[PDB]
Amino acid sequence: HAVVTVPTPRGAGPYYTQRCGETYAVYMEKDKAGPIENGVAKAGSELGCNPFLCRGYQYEDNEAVEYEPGQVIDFHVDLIAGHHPGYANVSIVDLEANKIIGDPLRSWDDYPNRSDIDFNVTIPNTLGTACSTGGKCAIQWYWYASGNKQSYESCVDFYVKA
């Protein structure tokens, strides 16, 4: 059980409830640190979002922050319950394709272990126009608890002027 608290990641809003459905939205907001699979299972055929992209949180409910190439961003992860074994990465995802841009900004082969709950990441110089405006990219923190086959996600929407 864990979730990013800094920077402020995407949270619930109207499009979230509309697109994921009441069952997913209500189950997943009773514990913002819970894994995704349990919400998918409860929702069954009601589910209408991709809960493996930003936990199903939606761009239109949130606002993208402006970052400069080479800028360093401090992350804090509120860790309610550690699970072993497992791995994590923090990467820039292209929201339209659901594919990572370039390399992971940070990778752990064993997560959690404190360079795991309090860490930073650097914006590349190599992004081009790919993140030029809001809603094209986000920084996704992703943790897979292999022991429990549990997925944890948080997103930070951002743009870099190209």
Ligand SMILES: *[C@@H]1O[C@H](CO)[C@@H](O[C@@H]2O[C@H](CO)[C@@H](O[C@@H]3O[C@H](CO[C@H]4O[C@H](CO)[C@@H](O)[C@H](O[C@H]5O[C@H](CO)[C@@H](O)[C@H](O)[C@@H]5O)[C@@H]4O)[C@@H](O)[C@H](O[C@H]4O[C@H](CO)[C@@H](O)[C@H](O)[C@@H]4O[C@H]4O[C@H](CO)[C@@H](O)[C@H](O)[C@@H]4O)[C@@H]3O)[C@H](O)[C@H]2NC(C)=O)[C@H](O)[C@H]1NC(C)=O
């Ligand atoms: C580093 O962190 C990153 C994140 O930043 C991690 O990457 C993520 O890892 C997860 C887990 O692997 C990925 O989620 C999974 O994605 C699966 C692959 O699918 C995509 O393929 C194509 C082309 O890209 C798309 O078209 C697909 O989209 C379609 O489906 C989605 C919804 O799934 C729709 O919204 C679209 O409209 C498309 O039609 C995919 O994006 C995906 O299969 C998988 O979901 C299956 O599994 C879950 C349960 O686990 C089910 O709820 C769901 O129904 C899916 O089930 C299908 O497949 C299984 C077989 O596995 C069958 O049993 C089912 O019956 C059914 O056919 C899940 O969404 C995530 O996308 C990926 N994120 C990235 C890359 O950004 C890295 O792993 C991590 N790495 C390290 C080292 O840390």
Ligand SMILES: *[C@@H]1O[C@H](CO)[C@@H](O)[C@H](O)[C@H]1NC(C)=O
């Ligand atoms: C970023 O993380 C490294 C690794 O902990 C740390 O030592 C470094 O000083 C941090 N940089 C900033 C600017 O906070």
Ligand SMILES: [Cu+2]
């Ligand atoms: Cu947990």
